[PDB]
Structure formats: structure tokens, C-alpha cells
């Protein structure tokens, strides 16, 4: 059909590729449709679209965003697809979220410093290079200074619940994120549901709350994932009347990560792009 990837990041958030480098890579990997879904920002989207046109690439760019929200005291990520980057409602939410991120980074650095060494905040600010600061920026600092062996080990030792540097979530609500994405003309997507580490009971509660908030879709496919896991999440999407999304969550290349990799949907699920009028 088409090769589609609806979750990726640039250096506007915690990706390591500029939007130009991400787009060049997508073209080389024959991606037909790419969403850029940076964390609590839309700063790359207008320039990315202009770059594609200037380069005469055939890639279809989907305007996106990844919004941190709080639900039942958990950090839940809601992606918006086909948003208007100039939306006033969305821009106001982005400004509030970015102010929260400044305050949160100060507190995370304050706590992480007690378990590591002085200078955490200023050096993580250098890593973020003007982007809104995320846990991934702190994780790189932790790896680069030998407190963890890789980005996967970081979160077993730091930043997460019951580990040094943890700060509880203090974001907008899921319903606020969904309302703002809709006001910007987009579809709201419950991102990476398996990453929340919830029991089936709690995952069903989350999906119910997301539907009740007006949510449109859930990510069913990601690169590191078994067919059975896809089948279970596809069953949930069907049961809860949600469309299915797919995305790599690319931040940088690795043996286990690539644009478009392992992004297929199981039988019966309706894709989030069914009414986008795409072509290969
Ligand atoms: Mg990220
Ligand atoms: Mg996320
Ligand atoms: Mn992401």
C-alpha cells in the first residue's frame, strides 16, 4: 500500500537528527508518509514542509505533536496528527506545557544531583540545545557520564518511579490535550500503550477514559514488538472503537530502531489514515 510512520522526533525535541536529516533518511528508506511528532512543540513543522517542497521529495508530511498528559497520576503521551501548527488553542497549550517543562527540569536536576554530581541542569540544558527538556535529555547525560550503560538501562536506575531524579507528572489532562488537538483540526492518538506497564485492568481503564475524552486512535504497531502484542492491541482498538496508528518513535538510528520498521497492522483493525486520501 504505502509505507507509513506516524511517530518520529527531531532536534526540536529529543531527536538527534535535524528535520532535514530526518526527512532525508525517510526518503532513502522509501517512507511515503511521515509524521513529525515532537514533544510539546511544533517548531520543526513549517520548515520541514518547506524543505520537502524545495528538495522536490515525494514524501507526504503529517503535522504532528506528542503531548505529555496526566491521567490518574500517570504520565500518558497523546499524539496529535494533522494538526494546524498555527492553532491558537494548541499554541496556548504548548506554551503552558513548555513552562511546566522548565520547572520540571529544574526539579529533576535538583533531585538527580543528589545521586550523581554537581552541574546536572546546565549540562542537560546544553544537550537540549534550546528544545523543551525531556527525560531523554537527562538519560543521555546519565549514559555519557557512565551512570548507566545504555538508554534502556537508564530507566531501570533513574528518572522513573522509585529511582533518583523521579518527579511525579504535573501536565495538562488527557481531555485537555484531546480538546486542543481537535481544536487544531487533528486526530488524537493514545501513544505506545504497552510502554505504560499497566495491568490489563488499568490499560482498559485508560482506554475507556481516552474514548470518553473524545480520543480517536491508539498506536497498535511499533518496532520492538511481537505479532501477539500487535494482535492484542489491535483487538483492544477494535473493542474500544479506536482507529489504529503505527510509528517508530525514531530518535536516532540503532540496530533495533529504524523509520518504518515492523509497522504493520493486524487483520480487522481500521487505520487512523483510512480517510486521509493518501496515495503511494
Ligand atoms: Mg522523546
Ligand atoms: Mg512518548
Ligand atoms: Mn515519542
UniProtKB/TrEMBL annotation:
CDD domains: PHP_HisPPase_AMP (cd07438)
Stretches assigned to the Polymerase/histidinol phosphatase N-terminal domain: 4-71
Name under which the protein is recorded: 5'-3' exoribonuclease Rnm
InterPro entries attached to this UniProt entry: PHP_dom (IPR004013), PHP_domain (IPR052018), Pol/His_phosphatase_N (IPR003141), Pol/histidinol_Pase-like (IPR016195)
Family: Belongs to the PHP family. TrpH/YciV subfamily.
Keywords for this protein: Exonuclease, Hydrolase, Manganese, Metal-binding, Nuclease, Nucleotide-binding, rRNA processing
Record carries keyword Metal-binding: yes
Catalytic activity: a ribonucleoside 3',5'-bisphosphate + H2O = a ribonucleoside 5'-phosphate + phosphate
EC id: 3.1.3.97
Signal peptide: none
Species whose genome carries this gene: Vibrio cholerae
Molecular function terms, GO-annotated: 3',5'-nucleotide bisphosphate phosphatase activity; 5'-3' DNA exonuclease activity; 5'-3' RNA exonuclease activity; metal ion binding; nucleotide binding
Amino acid at each position: 500500500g504505502m509505507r507509513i510512520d506516524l511517530h518520529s522526533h527531531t532536534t526540536a525535541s529529543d531527536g538527534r537528527f535535524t528535520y532535514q536529516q530526518l526527512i532525508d533518511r525517510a526518503v532513502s528508506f522509501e517512507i511515503d508518509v511521515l509524521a513529525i511528532t515532537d514533544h510539546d512543540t511544533v517548531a520543526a513543522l513549517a520548515d520541514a514542509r518547506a524543505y520537502i517542497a524545495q528538495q522536490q521529495y515525494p514524501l507526504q508530511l503529517v503535522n504532528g505533536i506528542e503531548i505529555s498528559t496526566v491521567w490518574q497520576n500517570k504520565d500518558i503521551h497523546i499524539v496529535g496528527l494533522n494538526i494546524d501548527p498555527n492553532s491558537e488553542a494548541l499554541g496556548q497549550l504548548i506554551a503552558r506545557q513548555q513552562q511546566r517543562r522548565v520547572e520540571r527540569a529544574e526539579l529533576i536536576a535538583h533531585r538527580l544531583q543528589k545521586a550523581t554530581r554537581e552541574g546536572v541542569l546546565e549540562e542537560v540544558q546544553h544537550i537540549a540545545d534550546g528544545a523543551p527538556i525531556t527525560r531523554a535529555h537527562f538519560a543521555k547525560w546519565l549514559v555519557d557520564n557512565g551512570y548507566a550503560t545504555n538508554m534502556q538501562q537508564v530507566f531501570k536506575k533513574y528518572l522513573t518511579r522509585d529511582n533518583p531524579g523521579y518527579v511525579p507528572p504535573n501536565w495538562c489532562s488527557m481531555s485537555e490535550a484531546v480538546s486542543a488537538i481537535h481544536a487544531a483540526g487533528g486526530q488524537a492518538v493514545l501513544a505506545h500503550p504497552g510502554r505504560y506497564d499497566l495491568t490489563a485492568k488499568w490499560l482498559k481503564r485508560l482506554m475507556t477514559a481516552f474514548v470518553e475524552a473524545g480520543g480517536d486512535a491508539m498506536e497498535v504497531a511499533q518496532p520492538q514488538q511481537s505479532p501477539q502484542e500487535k494482535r492484542t492491541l489491535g483487538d483492544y482498538a477494535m473493542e474500544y472503537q479506536l482507529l489504529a496508528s503505527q510509528g517508530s518513535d525514531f530518535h536516532y538510528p540503532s540496530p533495533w530502531m529504524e523509520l518504518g520498521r515492523n509497522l504493520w497492522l493486524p487483520a480487522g483493525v481500521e487505520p487512523v489514515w483510512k480517510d486521509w486520501g493518501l496515495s503511494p
